Amino acid sequence: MNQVSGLAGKESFILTRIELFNWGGFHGLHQAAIHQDGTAVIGPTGSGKT
Amino acid sequence: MNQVSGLAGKESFILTRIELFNWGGFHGLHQAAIHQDGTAVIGPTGSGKTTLVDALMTLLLANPRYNLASTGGHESDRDLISYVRGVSGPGDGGEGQSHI
Amino acid sequence: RKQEVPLPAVGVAVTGIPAIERLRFKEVDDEAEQTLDLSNHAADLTQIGDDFWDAFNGLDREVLIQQTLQLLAKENRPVGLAELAELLPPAHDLETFAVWIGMAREAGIEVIDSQREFAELSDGEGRRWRFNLPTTGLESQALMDIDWE
Amino acid sequence: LGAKALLDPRFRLEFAVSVMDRQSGNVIESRTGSQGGSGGEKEIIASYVLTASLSYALSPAGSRYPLFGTIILDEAFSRSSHAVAGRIIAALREFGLHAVFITPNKEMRLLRDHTRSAIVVHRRGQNSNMASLSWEELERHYQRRGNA
Amino acid sequence: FITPNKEMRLLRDHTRSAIVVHRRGQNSNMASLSWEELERHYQRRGNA
Structure with a gap:
């Protein structure tokens, strides 16, 4: 399933990481570990996902 | 959660039944009953639910x-004529897009 | 009012010329008897797709709260996420994990995500797995104080 | 729609889709079959159409890959079937687009199956806050000689 | 009550009973159910 994401990067600019600092409600520094094999972002109504 | 049954039944009339035939997205004779103390209606998105809600409101x-459930608060793609004839033009999409 | 008046006849259309050819007739000779139908149209009740039934089995966060609060009262100490994983290996696995993180963020006791701790967990049909988690302080008083509407 | 046709170049010409057989060029599908109610079936074809849009738009001329690799989806699959979303991800595999997905604390088993990490977010009042998580399949064994 | 596919869980948790409507071709059929009858039908689906 996830293989062509591992191949990706070597093929194209794929994304695995994110940081914030006082963006929206994200006070202080917050970070996100996106995986080289796809990732999810899960949160309830009005959590800061959007 | 479910146990506020007290006031119901006595003062007011309470909807527990439906009788149907050749209506809307349904076909042939159908029947059902609501639970006098609370009920829900479930099914796939696009499981004739909106049309079954219409079946009540028409009376x-x-x-x-x-078609208000599927079409929020405005004029809709479906009307009495379509429901009566069973028309489902926009729905089928690739069979005959009228499917009467 | 119904009295006639002397006015000219203009646009005087003749009409209804009584020609016998104009006669056609009822032709019940087409003696059809259309469909009577009253059958009770019940049918298979289960066919509907899978994700519907997945919602039919969706996790309940309140019972999860019961379990986790009992676990943290028993532990009577801060509990990291992997520790929770082995303490009560969930079947709705990353569901309980996301909810646990939401709890820790809702609960106030320190929450950290700068390290990788792991736990192996089996799903509803036993099929086993591994996970990668941060550490955080889950504790009885914290979650108990907070409500879980 | 008349004004849209006259002014809008896009409206000047309708757009269609068809599923071909690679081996002969034969046609198998040319139109939708479920398009009403609140459901949907088109999503498998439309997934590959959207992948075409993004892969081509991100790819240099004639490049097998889109040079930009990542795609995002807010609310991802909170409205799509499990199989439909899996096919979406697979279509993104066809061009290797590193896919990112969002959901309002839903779409559980699907995201487990097709991705390998998530970033959990929660809001305590005015403050939102993140965490990073992942799930790794057992190299030892899912469960020896059992269902996997 | 009416509901999309999701969030039925609370209805189970907070209602006496349920009717269900089918989609089957351009044809739909209904069923009057109790919650545990629905669970048993789902169990029958899982077993068969």
Whole structure:
């Protein structure tokens, strides 16, 4: 399933990481570990996902 | 959660039944009953649910804002004529897009 | 009012010329008897797709709260996420994990995500797995104080 | 729609889709079959159409890959079937687009199956806050000689 | 009550009973159910 994401990067600019600092409600520094094999972002109504 | 049954049944009339035939997205004779103490209706998105809600409202106004459950609060793609004839033009999409 | 008046006849259309050819007739000779139908149209009740039934089995966060609060009262100490994983290996696995993180963020006791701790967990049909988690302080008083509407 | 046709170049010409057989060029599908109610079936074809849009738009001329690799989806699959979303991800595999997905604390088993990490977010009042998580399949064994 | 596919869980948790409607071709059929009858039908689906 996830293989062509591992191949990706070597093929194209794929994304695995994110940081914030006082963006929206994200006070202080917050970070996100996106995986080289796809990732999810899960949160309830009005959590800061959007 | 479910146990506020007290006031119901006595003062007011309470909807527990439906009788149907050749209506809307349904076909042939159908029947059902609501639970006198609370009920829900479930099914796939696009499981004739909106049309079954219409089936009630048609008896309870001059003119309903048709198809309102699937079409929020405005004029809709479906009306009495379509439901009566069973028309489902926009739905099938690739069979005959009228499918009467 | 019904009295006639002397006015000219203009646009005087003749009409209805009584020609016998104009006669056609009822032809019930087409003696059809259309469909009577009253059958009770019940049918298979289960066919509907899978994700519907997945929602039919969706996790309940309140019972999860019961379990986790009992676990943290028993532990009577801060509990990291992997520790929770082995303490009560969930079947709705990353569901309980996301909810646990939401709890820790809702609960106030320190929450950290700068390290990788792991736990192996089996799903509803036993099929086993591994996970990668941060550490955080889950504790009885914290979650108990907070409500879980 | 008349004004849209006259002014809008896009409206000047309708757009269609068809499923071909690679081996002969034969046609198998040319139109939708479920398009009403609140459901949907088109999503498998439309997934590959959207992948075409993004892969081509991100790819240099004639490049097998889109040079930009990542795609995002807010609310991802909170409205799509499990199989439909899996096919979406697979279509993104066809061009290798590193896919990112969002959901309002839903779409559980699907995201487990097709991705390998998530970033959990929660809001305590005015403050939102993140965490990073992942799930790794057992190299030892899912469960020896059992269902996997 | 009416509901999309999701969030039925609370209805189970907070209602006496349920009717269900089918989609089957351009044809739909209904069923009057109790919650545990629905669970048993789902169990029958899982077993068969």
